[PDB]
């Protein structure tokens with residue numbers, strides 16, 4: 001009898017921690033310790049997918065005196081309209097109503113074309129340079145920040161201003177750094193909303209300003225833009241790094257994709273499903289029970305914290321045969337959980353898929369000999385950031 005304690009050790013730089021796979025083998029749900037409060041950990045695909053669609057399980061904390069959070073997590077939860085359990089239903093509903101139509105088929109079609117040319121240009125610069133090159137700096141970081149510049153209608157050079165702000169806002173190890181960085185994000189976005197009020201374009205804030213004959217306050221609009229800025233590039237950067245690392249580990253699938261870029265959508269779904277870094281703390285979706293819920297033979301009581309392990313569920317042999325294997329030839333694979341599911345299903349997921357598809361359509365066709373210039377074990381996953389990630393990916397080609 002030994003209460004398991006999150007985060008679990010991972011001897012590899014990717015994948016799921018052995019202890020979490022061991023718990024998954026025993027059953028769908030276990031009581032675990034964490035850095036803060038104890039929580040129920042749900043590790044099997046069927047139960048994680050079910051609980052994500054259960055409206056009794058919500059982001060907001062209903063408890064009368066809530067456990068303390070890092071500044072980073074508090075900012076995250078506020079950007080997701082989960083900071084007040086009494087107003088979360090109306091506020092979260094409004095958030096999704098206002099953001100979903102910003103990712104229209106018209107906008108996505110136009111952005112796919114620009115994304116494709118941009119990747120072409122990024123790879124031509126990469127191919128013209130002398131190895132070793134940091135693939136994270138010159139490819140992974142550059143495409144998703146370009147996309148956010150396009151969404152917000154700002155010059156591309158602005159990403160050199162905001163490109164580290166998600167990392168800094170979400171630094172759980174330094175409350176003061178987190179708050180100072182979020183203040184910069186806020187100041188920037190308020191500047192931007194004031195400009196878009198007199199100089200609109202074909203971009204997200206201009207559409208928010210025009211919404212409901214202009215009924216939204218500057219604070220309301222900047223909130224929504226901050227969510228786009230802070231959720232809209234960093235996680236995608238990390239998936240380009242993880243997808244590259246995964247394809248480097250699987251040369252047969254990599255050669256298949258290089259030969260047939262029509263496999264890129266399938267590859268991207270495998271990358272999302274298998275792409276978990278380090279101790280994988282970002283592959284947990286946190287919730288609180290707002291009513292009692294029975295999971296198998298376990299009773300989750302109102303007020304309990306629940307960690308929905310989307311990473312472990314995406315590796316679950318019960319949902320994906322040979323769940324640990326990268327196989328872009330899977331026939332009708334189940335929908336992975338990397339974007340979540342239910343009420344908070346990732347608003348940007350179609351755009352993120354467009355970005356990743358454009359990259360991996362091209363990468364190994366344009367640079368067939370691309371490979372790591374350093375050992376895998378020297379790559380350092382950044383555990384203190386809510387979004388994790390690697391700081392550099394040195395390559396040769």
Ligand code: HEM
Pocket residue numbers: 059080096099227228231232233235236239285286337338339340341343344345346347348349351352
């Ligand atoms: C590969 C890249 C991405 C991954 C893996 C990812 C993953 C996720 C996940 C798992 C959630 C649900 C969190 C929860 O249920 O607590 C989420 C929510 C969200 N995502 Fe994404 N995301 C990605 C990219 C993006 C992009 C590109 C955008 C927009 C430009 C975006 C905007 C959002 C927003 C606004 C939410 C909040 C939805 C809500 O709370 O209702 N994300 N994302």
Ligand SMILES: CC1(C)C[C@H]2C[C@@H](C(=O)O)[C@@H]3COC(=O)[C@]4(CO4)[C@]23C1
Pocket residue numbers: 231235281282283284285286386387388
């Ligand atoms: C709004 C988010 C940025 C979306 C998810 C992406 C995930 C990641 O970075 O992989 C990040 C980590 O922390 C979480 O609570 C997650 C899992 O819900 C998120 C929060």
